[PDB]
Amino acid sequence: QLLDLAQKHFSGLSGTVPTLSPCRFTGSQICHREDGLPLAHVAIAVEGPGWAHPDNVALQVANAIIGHYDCTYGGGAHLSSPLASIAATNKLCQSFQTFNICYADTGLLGAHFVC
Amino acid sequence: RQFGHLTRVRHVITYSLSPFEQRAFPHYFSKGIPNVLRRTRACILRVAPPFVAFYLVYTWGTQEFEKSKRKNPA
């Protein structure tokens, strides 16, 4: 029924090419020092593989090992992730997340922390 | 005092690049020779004058010692 409705409403839509250039990744640093703000944000990432690659699975396993943390998280010192237990134990940060941002044939694999 | 409370800085953006993304010697002679000339023109009138005078006082006084050790007709 969905397919019928598609045919009924969308079929006038043109299909007659913007394709995506590779995107070059660069090892680099951008630092907006603004002492007047009360906490520091840092995001760090390596070039990731991109949507299609089977490595994204193993990478997400690894990211999950390391994890995410927030100063409301109940787990604290006893947490499974060493990053998180250590960050809780020693008040190293308010929060952090690992991420694997995916694009066509590239990506950002890393972590952001606020501290 | 260590990195973290050195001083207070606001509103300054630093952009930079990994060394492995970049040349060790960007335009080493084409920019560098001109720059070195510029650097030297800047200082030589401060630095060189004394050493000129040294060379002269040393030239003169060495040869004044020469002359005084000779005999003269009298």
Q: What is the DSSP string of A9-43?
A: HHTTS------PPP-----EEEEEEETTSSS-EEE
Verify whether the Cβ–Cβ distance A26 to B17 is below 8 Å.
Answer: yes
Burial (0-12, 13-18, 19+ Cβ within 10 Å), B42: exposed
**One-letter identity of residue A19:** T
Verify whether the Cβ–Cβ distance A28 to B12 is below 8 Å.
Answer: no
Compare CB distances from B10 to A30, A31, A36 and report the shortest one's residue: A36
* Residue A59 · residue A48 · CB < 8 Å: yes
Name the nearest CA neighbour of A52 among A99, A109, A107, A98.
A107
Strand partners, B17: A28
Q: What residues of chain A lie within 8 A of the CB of B16, using their CB?
A: 28-29
Total H helices, total E strands in chain A: 3, 5
A54 close contact with B: CB closer than 8 A: no
**Backbone interruptions in chain A following residues (C to N > 2.5 Å):** 16
How far is Cα A97 from Cα A42, in angstroms, rounded to an integer?
11
- Residue of A29, A44, A115 to mutate when probing chain B, most B C-beta within 10 A: A29
Residues ≥6 apart with Cβ < 8 Å to B48: none
Question: What architecture is domain B1-74?
Answer: Up-down Bundle (1.20)
* Residue A74 · residue A88 · CB < 8 Å: no
* Residue B21 · residue A26 · CB < 8 Å: yes
Q: Resolution of this entry in Å?
A: 3.5
Buried b (16+ CB within 10 A) or exposed e, A26-61: eeeeeeeeeeeeeeeeeeebeebbbeeeeebeebee
How far is Cα A47 from Cα A102, in angstroms, rounded to an integer?
10
How far is Cα A111 from Cα A83, in angstroms, rounded to an integer?
11
Residues ≥6 apart with Cβ < 8 Å to A111: A43, A44, A45, A66, A96, A97, A98, A99
Up-side HSE of residue B52: CA atoms within 13 Å toward CB? 6
Verify whether the Cβ–Cβ distance A33 to B10 is below 8 Å.
Answer: yes
DSSP β-ladder status, A68-70 and A28-34: unpaired
Structure tokens belonging to residue A64: 């999950």
Verify whether the Cβ–Cβ distance A29 to B16 is below 8 Å.
Answer: yes
Q: Which helix (H) or strand (E) holds A83?
A: helix A82-89
Structure tokens belonging to residue B19: 């060394």
Strand partners, A46: A109
Return the DSSP state at B21. G
Verify whether the Cβ–Cβ distance A34 to B15 is below 8 Å.
Answer: no
Name the nearest CA neighbour of A45 among A104, A107, A96, A93.
A107
Number of C-beta neighbours around residue A67 at 10 A: 20
How far is Cα A75 from Cα A82, in angstroms, rounded to an integer?
12
Name the nearest CA neighbour of A99 among A37, A23, A24, A42.
A42
How far is Cα A25 from Cα A103, in angstroms, rounded to an integer?
12
* Residue A99 · residue A62 · CB < 8 Å: no
Residues ≥6 apart with Cβ < 8 Å to A30: B13, B14, B15
Minimum distance, in Å, between the CA of residue B40 and any CA atom of chain A: 34
